[PDB]
Design a protein around this ligand. Structure first.
Ligand code: 7IW
Ligand code: NAG
Ligand code: NAG
Ligand code: NAG
Ligand code: NAG
Ligand code: NAG
Ligand code: NAG
Ligand code: NAG
Length: 335
C-alpha cells in the first residue's frame, strides 16, 4: 500500500466540475502506456480487500463536496450552509497510477470473478479510465465483460454481502425530466431487459444449481437504495424500479412479471432536494431543479443485487465502494 495518483484528460478551460476538480488534483494521462504481460507469473487478487477502492472513494468524496455544494448540510447535530449554484455536471474518466517504486498488476482472465488466483497477469502504470458514476441498483456507464456475464461477491452464501453482476452487453436507459417540475421518467427497451435478465438468471442458477431465480423490487430502506437513485446534470433523480426487478426464471426460461407498455418499461422518478448522503451519515439540501430538458442517456453495464424452495434477488447498493470495485477488480497495487 502506497498513495496513488490520478491521471485525467480533463481540460483547464471547461467549467464542468469533474474537469475543474481533475485539473486541480490529477496529472495528464500519458500516451506512454506500457503494458507488460507475464503468462507464468500468477498472482492472487481480492476485489473486496483492495485499498485502491478506498483511495478512489476518498477522491470521489472530495470531488463531490468540492463540486456539489449543498445549500444545507446536516451532520451530527450541526448544519453547514454555503453557496449552492447550479453547475455543469458530467463525469469524465479517471486513471489511478502507482508512484515510482510501485506497479499495478492487472488480471487478463476474461472470466475472472474478482477473487482468487489469476494465471495471466500484466503490469501497468495506470488503470483504465473510470467514470466516478454514483448510483444505486444499476451500474451506469461502466465497462463490459469481454466474454460471459460475471457474478462477483465477497461471500455468495452470506445474504448480506452485495452481489455485483457484470454484464457483457449494455442495456440503454434514457431518463428525462421533460420541458410538476420534479416528475421525470426513464425508458428501457423491455426486450433487451428480457434477454439480459434471463442470461443473468442462467448464471445465478449456476451458482444456485431447484433454486428458481426471482427478481423482486427493493425491500425497504432509505429512498436512495429502494430506488434507482443517481445524479444527472446535477439533479438527484430517484427512479422507481418496481416494474424492472420483477420477474421469474424457472426451468431455464425467464418471464417478466413487471408492467410494460408497447414494449418499453418506464420508471417513474422524482428529482429530490433532500438527499441522504452516500459520502457520510447525514443529509444534503439542494436548490430546486434547473429549467428545461434534463436528460441522461446512459448504458446499464451492471447490477447491484441482494439475496433474501427458491432464491429471491432484489436491487441493492448504497455503498458506492461497490461501484468502484466493479471497475477496480482486475487491479492490485504492488511494490
Ligand atoms: C446493505 N446496505 C448498506 C448501506 C445502505 C445505505 C447506505 C450505506 C450502506 C452508506 C455508505 C457509507 C460508506 O460509503 C462510507 O463512506 C450510506 C450511509 N450514509 C447515510 N445513511 N447518510 C447509505 N448510502 C446512501 O445514503 C446513498 O448511497 N445515497 C445516494 C445519494 C445520491 C445519489 Cl445520486 C445516490 F445514488 C445515492
Ligand atoms: C471465484 O473464483 C475462485 C477461484 O478462482 C473461487 O475460490 C471463488 O469461490 C469464486 N467466487 C465466486 C463468487 O464465484
Ligand atoms: C453474454 O453472456 C451470455 C452468458 O452469460 C451469453 O449467452 C451471451 O452470448 C454473451 N454475449 C456475448 C458474448 O456477446
Ligand atoms: C461465507 O460464509 C459461510 C457461512 O456464513 C462460511 O462457511 C464461509 O467460510 C464464508 N466464506 C467464503 C465462502 O469464502
Ligand atoms: C415504486 O412504485 C410502486 C408502485 O408504483 C410502489 O408500490 C412503491 O412503494 C414505489 N417505491 C418507492 C420506493 O417509492
Ligand atoms: C410487479 O409489477 C406488478 C405491476 O406493476 C405489481 O403488481 C407486482 O407487485 C410487482 N411485483 C413485485 C412487487 O414483486
Ligand atoms: C420480452 O419483451 C417482449 C416485448 O418487447 C415480449 O414480447 C417478449 O415475450 C418478452 N420475452 C420474455 C422471455 O419475457
Ligand atoms: C453516461 O454517458 C453519457 C455520455 O456522456 C451521458 O450523456 C450520461 O449522462 C452518462 N450517465 C450518467 C449517469 O452520468
Amino acid at each position: 500500500k502506497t498513495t496513488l495518483f490520478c491521471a485525467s484528460d480533463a481540460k483547464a478551460y471547461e467549467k464542468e466540475v469533474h474537469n475543474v476538480w481533475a485539473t486541480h488534483a490529477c496529472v495528464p494521462t500519458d500516451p506512454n502506456p506500457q503494458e507488460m504481460v507475464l503468462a507464468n507469473v500468477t498472482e492472487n487478487f481480492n476485489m473486496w480487500k483492495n485499498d485502491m477502492v478506498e483511495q478512489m472513494h476518498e477522491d470521489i468524496i472530495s470531488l463531490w463536496d468540492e463540486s456539489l455544494k449543498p445549500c444545507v448540510k446536516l451532520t451530527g447535530g450541526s448544519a453547514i450552509t454555503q453557496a449552492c449554484p447550479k453547475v455543469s455536471f458530467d463525469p469524465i474518466p479517471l486513471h489511478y497510477c502507482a508512484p515510482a517504486g510501485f506497479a499495478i498488476l492487472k488480471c487478463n482472465n476474461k472470466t475472472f470473478n474478482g477473487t482468487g488466483p489469476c494465471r495471466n497477469v500484466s503490469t501497468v502504470q495506470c488503470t483504465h479510465g473510470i467514470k466516478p458514476v454514483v448510483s444505486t441498483q444499476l451500474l451506469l456507464n461502466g465497462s463490459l465483460a469481454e466474454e460471459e456475464i460475471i457474478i462477483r461477491s465477497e461471500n455468495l452464501t452470506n445474504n448480506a454481502k452485495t452481489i455485483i453482476v457484470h454484464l457483457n452487453e449494455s442495456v440503454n436507459i434514457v431518463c428525462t425530466r421533460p420541458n410538476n417540475i420534479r416528475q421525470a421518467h426513464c425508458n428501457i427497451n423491455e426486450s433487451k431487459w428480457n434477454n439480459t435478465l434471463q442470461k443473468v438468471g442462467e448464471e445465478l442458477a449456476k451458482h444456485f444449481p431447484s433454486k428458481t431465480i426471482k427478481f423482486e423490487p427493493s425491500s425497504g430502506g432509505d429512498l436512495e437504495i429502494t430506488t434507482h437513485s443517481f445524479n444527472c446534470r446535477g439533479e438527484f433523480f430517484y427512479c422507481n424500479t418496481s416494474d424492472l426487478f420483477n420477474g421469474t426464471y424457472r426451468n431455464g426460461t425467464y418471464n417478466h412479471t413487471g408492467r410494460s407498455s408497447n414494449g418499453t418499461i418506464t420508471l417513474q422518478c422524482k428529482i429530490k432536494q433532500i438527499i441522504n448522503m452516500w459520502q457520510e451519515v447525514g443529509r444534503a439540501i439542494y436548490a430546486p431543479p434547473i429549467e428545461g430538458e434534463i436528460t441522461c442517456n446512459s448504458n446499464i453495464t451492471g447490477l447491484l443485487l441482494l439475496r433474501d424452495d427458491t432464491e429471491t434477488f432484489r436491487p441493492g447498493g448504497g455503498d458506492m465502494r461497490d461501484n468502484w470495485r466493479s471497475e477496480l477488480y482486475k487491479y492490485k497495487v504492488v511494490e
